[PDB]
């Protein structure tokens, strides 16, 4: 049974330095199995630097939960958004490379990211 922390790595982590990326990664990381996710962000940093965010700036998630954290620094990311004619099971993404703060919700001890909220 995949843990939430491991799913976060599968959905959100690609430490390698980076217009088709999103289309290719959403398919290949097996993220479009059940429905098209409307947005999904990949983070191009070490896993450690991402897990570190859980001890950086405590913020509210968009939904109002308060166990979210914003990276003190911006991070290299790819933002993937549904575009054009995307329709399950044929999902379609627009790719945008950026440098933005990430906001994650953290759970557990060890306290690690379990949900990617937004990039700002």
């Amino acid at each position, epitope marked *: 049974k995949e843990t939430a922390a491991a799913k976060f790595e599968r959905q959100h982590m690609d430490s390698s330095t980076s217009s088709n990326y999103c289309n290719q990664m959403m398919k290949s990381r097996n993220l479009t199995k059940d429905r098209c996710k409307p947005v999904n962000t990949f983070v191009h940093e070490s896993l450690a630097d991402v897990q570190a965010v859980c001890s950086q700036k405590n913020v509210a998630c968009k939904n109002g939960q308060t*166990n979210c954290y914003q990276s003190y620094s911006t991070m290299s990311i790819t933002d993937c958004r549904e575009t054009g004619s995307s329709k399950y099971p044929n999902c379609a993404y627009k790719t945008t490379q950026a440098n933005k703060h990430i906001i994650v919700a953290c759970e557990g001890n060890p306290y690690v990211p379990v949900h990617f909220d937004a990039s700002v």
Partner: nanobody, 120 residues
Framework: QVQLVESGGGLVQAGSLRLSCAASGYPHPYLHMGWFRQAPGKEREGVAA????????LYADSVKGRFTISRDKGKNTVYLQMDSLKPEDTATYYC??????????????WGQGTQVTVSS
């Protein structure tokens, strides 16, 4: 410094104690801070938590009317005033910060634990 440090606690009778906890070196507000306990024989449970900006205060049903939580304004310090104490309040108490409401798994930043043993 950055880590939470608890004080107070120990032996008490059916009766009063005041626990305190500070993370003075964490240099932003922790949105939620609160207290959890693990009573002998029982899963850890949240006892009280309070938001930094008016977003809410919460008590476990079993302590309503007996315990009162408070926080310093804009310093990461949280207090638990414990009155009307019962033997079943015996427990290791823990300060927590940076999580949401009374959800143990959402808190990853903890004090060191404080034993409270309530006698007849």
């Amino acid at each position: 410094q950055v880590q939470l440090v608890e004080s107070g606690g120990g032996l008490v009778q059916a009766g009063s104690l005041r626990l305190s906890c500070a993370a003075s070196g964490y240099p932003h507000p922790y949105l939620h801070m609160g207290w959890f306990r693990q009573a002998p024989g029982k899963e850890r449970e949240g006892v009280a938590a309070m938001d930094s900006g008016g977003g809410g205060t919460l008590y476990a049903d079993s302590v309503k009317g007996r315990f009162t939580i408070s926080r310093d304004k804009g310093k990461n310090t949280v207090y638990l005033q414990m009155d009307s104490l019962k033997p079943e309040d015996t427990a290791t108490y823990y300060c927590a910060a940076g999580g949401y409401q009374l959800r143990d798994r959402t808190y990853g930043h903890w004090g060191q634990g404080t034993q409270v043993t309530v006698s007849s």
